[PDB]
Design an enzyme around this catalytic site. Sequence first.
Site, mmCIF file in Angstrom:
data_model
loop_
_atom_site.group_PDB
_atom_site.id
_atom_site.type_symbol
_atom_site.label_atom_id
_atom_site.label_comp_id
_atom_site.label_asym_id
_atom_site.label_seq_id
_atom_site.Cartn_x
_atom_site.Cartn_y
_atom_site.Cartn_z
ATOM 1 C CG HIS A 29 -0.695 0.149 2.504
ATOM 2 N ND1 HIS A 29 -0.062 1.287 2.961
ATOM 3 C CD2 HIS A 29 -0.928 -0.612 3.596
ATOM 4 C CE1 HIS A 29 0.128 1.195 4.264
ATOM 5 N NE2 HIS A 29 -0.405 0.039 4.682
ATOM 6 N N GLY A 44 2.712 5.886 10.438
ATOM 7 C CA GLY A 44 4.145 5.712 10.129
ATOM 8 C C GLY A 44 4.680 4.355 10.562
ATOM 9 C CB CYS A 77 2.576 0.702 7.513
ATOM 10 S SG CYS A 77 0.875 1.173 7.917
HETATM 11 C C1 LIG Z 1 -0.231 6.541 7.945
HETATM 12 C C2 LIG Z 1 -0.655 5.065 8.096
HETATM 13 O O1 LIG Z 1 0.217 4.314 8.610
HETATM 14 N N1 LIG Z 1 -1.909 4.533 7.723
HETATM 15 C C3 LIG Z 1 -2.323 3.092 7.867
HETATM 16 C C4 LIG Z 1 -3.426 2.701 6.816
HETATM 17 C C5 LIG Z 1 -2.982 2.876 5.321
HETATM 18 C C6 LIG Z 1 -3.627 1.983 4.200
HETATM 19 C C7 LIG Z 1 -3.631 2.438 2.860
HETATM 20 C C8 LIG Z 1 -4.198 1.676 1.814
HETATM 21 C C9 LIG Z 1 -4.782 0.435 2.085
HETATM 22 C C10 LIG Z 1 -4.792 -0.045 3.401
HETATM 23 C C11 LIG Z 1 -4.205 0.736 4.449
HETATM 24 C C12 LIG Z 1 -2.793 2.770 9.324
HETATM 25 O O2 LIG Z 1 -1.896 2.451 10.199
HETATM 26 O O3 LIG Z 1 -4.035 2.814 9.646
#
Ligand SMILES: CC(=O)N[C@H](CCc1ccccc1)C(=O)O
Lengths: 300, 305
Positions: free
Chosen positions: A41, A143, A145
């Site tokens: 992602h 941040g 992930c």
């Molecule tokens: C800034 C960040 O870390 N956002 C993520 C989700 C980011 C995301 C994007 C696309 C598909 C699935 C998930 C979280 O920890 O919730």
Amino acid sequence: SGFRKMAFPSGKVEGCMVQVTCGTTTLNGLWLDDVVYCPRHVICTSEDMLNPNYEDLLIRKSNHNFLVQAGNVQLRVIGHSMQNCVLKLKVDTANPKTPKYKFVRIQPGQTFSVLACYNGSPSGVYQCAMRPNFTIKGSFLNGSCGSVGFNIDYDCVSFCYMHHMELPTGVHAGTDLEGNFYGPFVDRQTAQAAGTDTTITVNVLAWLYAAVINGDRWFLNRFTTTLNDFNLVAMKYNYEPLTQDHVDILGPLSAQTGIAVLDMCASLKELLQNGMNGRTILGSALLEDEFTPFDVVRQC
Amino acid sequence: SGFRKMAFPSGKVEGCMVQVTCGTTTLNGLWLDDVVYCPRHVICTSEDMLNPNYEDLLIRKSNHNFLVQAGNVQLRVIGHSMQNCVLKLKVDTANPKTPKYKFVRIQPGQTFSVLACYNGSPSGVYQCAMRPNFTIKGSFLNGSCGSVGFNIDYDCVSFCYMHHMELPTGVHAGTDLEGNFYGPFVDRQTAQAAGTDTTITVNVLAWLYAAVINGDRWFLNRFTTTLNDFNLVAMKYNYEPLTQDHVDILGPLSAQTGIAVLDMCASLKELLQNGMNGRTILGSALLEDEFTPFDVVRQCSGVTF
Ligand SMILES: CC(=O)N[C@H](CCc1ccccc1)C(=O)O
Ligand SMILES: [Cl-]
Ligand SMILES: [Cl-]
Ligand code: NA
């Protein structure tokens, strides 16, 4: 003696953590030999969050759209491919800090350590379990992930989790290091909700055996139960069914304490009925389910 | 979101752990620059530990009586001295993995990470508080002596603890890295008991702030209190007195949540007098006191090393 939530020493994982940037999105990557693993992602934009076509977004990337940083060093990406929900970036340098490692997909009830990371740098380490609903109760900020979950049995690091997202209830979902999600979740921002969570029965029993090993006996009783009668009671408290596998797994703790697995099940039925009456077990006023039979034998 | 008992990343300390053997005693050492630090009680037999004369036992030993093993590498000991209850073994090689570090002495109520080790090999890491009675609620088996406790601040490791012994209640006692005991303990086989412990009030408040940051809010109420009023209820429930310094330290969390410290003290008064009425805060049915204000700020803002 004493009994603590204990994580694995994090050093072998620390030397594998990098920052991966694609677009305006930065998260963590895991650098093993000449591959960096991170959540796919990272290639999504703000309008590609609901229904990203990962095959389409990826084919439009060159190696030089991926900024990989190991401390101060920019690594050179020489290849990109996707395995399920994990992006693999081939780099021209093998990580000199690569430990002996393997990738293991775990089952609900299993525990592991998480090295929470931001911008490729470690913030802290803690212990988690894979919940029966295939979520983890982590501690993760934006941040985080690409942070990973791991076990270290005997100098070899088993990577079992990579962090992808936070669900609306504040619990976490992610993949194995082959990019396969735990549970029915997808790497899309479409509405998703964890199933009803249940208590990990085998782990509660293991932790009662740990309490006895550390000289607690106050919750024991003179009763036994059948496996079937135990399951009828426990499910009324949102406890997982106990299987004959679970009974077998408790055998060594049964033998060390001389308390039969179904005698300890009667003790748990009673604790569920009475609560603790202002007492604690190993410093908790709740029944703890994030210690496995294997964790208890290692620590005791 | 989420809130966990979280240790510092332990890698900087893993690279300093060695095995130290003197006769039949093996325990852990900390290898920094060209010195290995370990408990002086490594030089004792079983007989010795009852009434040890460490001065006397040490001057008898030579450098070659100390076997120091860094993984599969023997280090050569070229000097030995004692500082309080720590042994310093000078070796012929500086640890090439020596991090930026200093030795610090912590106060009761402060938290740190312990790297539990056996035969010089790191086994586990966990967070714990120096209790008001100067014990730690640790997890240690035979061979964990010389395991260390630390904090990290940016790239600097602050070493604050070395494990020496278990007390008969299952709690643990040790020294700073300059060999000064925490609490009224000595390194001999004798009758020693932990003083009666007390709850770390400022930490319980910090943890209530962590709960609010994570949307756990049921215990909040319209009331406020005074230090003097709260401290009479605190003293009654075996809680540490709340000082003005403690209020100041919670300043940031009070600001970032919109709950004043004395507003949260009124939540804590009601919890002590009433209990939780079958409810939980951050998955606990007890009031947790092993998170400092700085722990909560660090964990909830994602500070990195
Ligand atoms: C800034 C960040 O870390 N956002 C993520 C989700 C980011 C995301 C994007 C696309 C598909 C699935 C998930 C979280 O920890 O919730
Ligand atoms: Cl598993
Ligand atoms: Cl009840
Ligand atoms: Na209030």
